[PDB]
Amino acid sequence: MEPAAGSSMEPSADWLATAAARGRVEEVRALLEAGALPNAPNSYGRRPIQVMMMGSARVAELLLLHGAEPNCADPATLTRPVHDAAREGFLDTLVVLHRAGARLDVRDAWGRLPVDLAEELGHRDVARYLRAAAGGTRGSNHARIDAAEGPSDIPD
C-alpha cells in the first residue's frame, strides 16, 4: 500500500521507445547501446519504432539496427509500423524496415494499407516505393477480382 522512491539499479528499459517518440536520437543511441529492450511491453499497444519520431529515420535505425519490431504490429488495430513511415511522409524509414526484415504489405485491422495511407496524406514518394514492396501486383488502370476487404455489407 505504500510505494517507495528509489531502490533501483539503472532502471533502463522503456526509455528506448519513449525517447524515440520524443525525437531524441542521442537519448536512445546511448540507452539502446546500453541494453535498451526493443521488444519492451509498450503502454500504447504499439512498437519500439511505431512510436518513434517518424520524422527521423535515424531513430528507427537505432531500434532496427538493434532489432525492433519493424514487422510485428497490433493484434487489435494491426497498425503496422510501416504506416508510421509513409503516414509521416518519411521514406528513409521504410527502406530501413525493408533493410532489416520488415513486412510492408499488410492492412490495418480496419481495412486500409500502408501505401494507401500515403496516397491520402501527401507522401506519394513514400507510397510509391511502398506499392512496390507492399504487394507484387502493380496495375494502375486494372482491378483484382471483386473482393472488397473490410466491414461486411457494402452500402453505396
The x, y and z cell numbers of residue 109, run together, are 485491422
Residues 6+ apart with CB under 8 A from 20: 28, 48, 49, 51, 52, 53, 59, 60, 62, 63
If you compute the radius of gyration of the chain from its CA atoms, what whole number of angstroms results? 18
Fold topology of 1-156: 1.25.40
Measure the CA dihedral 73/74/77/82, to 10°.
Answer: -20
In contact, 82 and 130? CB cutoff 8 Å: yes
Interatomic CA distance for residues 88 and 55, integer angstroms: 7
Cα–Cα distance, 64 to 96 (Å, whole number): 7
Question: What is d(CA 2, CA 87) in angstroms, rounded to the nearest whole number?
Answer: 44
